[PDB]
Design a protein around this ligand. Structure first.
Ligand SMILES: Nc1cccc2[nH]cnc12
Ligand SMILES: [Cl-]
Ligand SMILES: [Cl-]
Ligand SMILES: [Zn+2]
Ligand SMILES: [Zn+2]
Length: 124
């Protein structure tokens, strides 16, 4: 395995950190590990990003910042404000994707209607 520090350093100093990690994953690289898994009942709302763990039976709940490429790389977030959607919150990851929470949050978008992940929880 490359190891978390080797992967995160490679992405952090890349001109495009998101593309560096996606290309690394596509190459067969081991996902970033040591995301902070939360103790929960799996009876929550199943919403994507929440003040407290909200995993349903089809999700795992994690500490938000631990699942954010930009937080883990200690680099600026790519928006005008440099605001992080995940920091200080809990993130629900479909169990089928929970081996790679950083890649999941990087690649996916929260539905502004139901507040669930588009293409997963979202039933709009
Ligand atoms: N997705 C899940 C549902 C119920 C229990 C579980 N323990 C770990 N993941 C779980
Ligand atoms: Cl580590
Ligand atoms: Cl979901
Ligand atoms: Zn972040
Ligand atoms: Zn929706």
């Amino acid at each position: 395995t490359m190891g978390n520090s080797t992967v995160l350093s490679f992405c952090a100093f890349a001109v495009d950190a998101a593309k560096a990690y996606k290309d690394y994953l596509a190459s067969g690289g081991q996902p970033i590990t040591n995301c902070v898994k939360m103790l929960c009942t799996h009876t929550g709302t199943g919403q994507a990003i929440t003040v407290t763990p909200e995993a349903n039976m089809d999700q795992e709940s994690f500490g938000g910042a631990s699942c954010c490429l930009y937080c883990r790389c200690h680099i600026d977030h790519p928006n005008p404000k440099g605001f992080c959607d995940l920091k200080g919150k809990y993130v629900q990851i479909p169990t089928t994707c929970a081996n790679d929470p950083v890649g999941f949050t990087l690649k996916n978008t929260v539905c502004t209607v139901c507040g669930m992940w588009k293409g997963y929880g979202c039933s709009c």
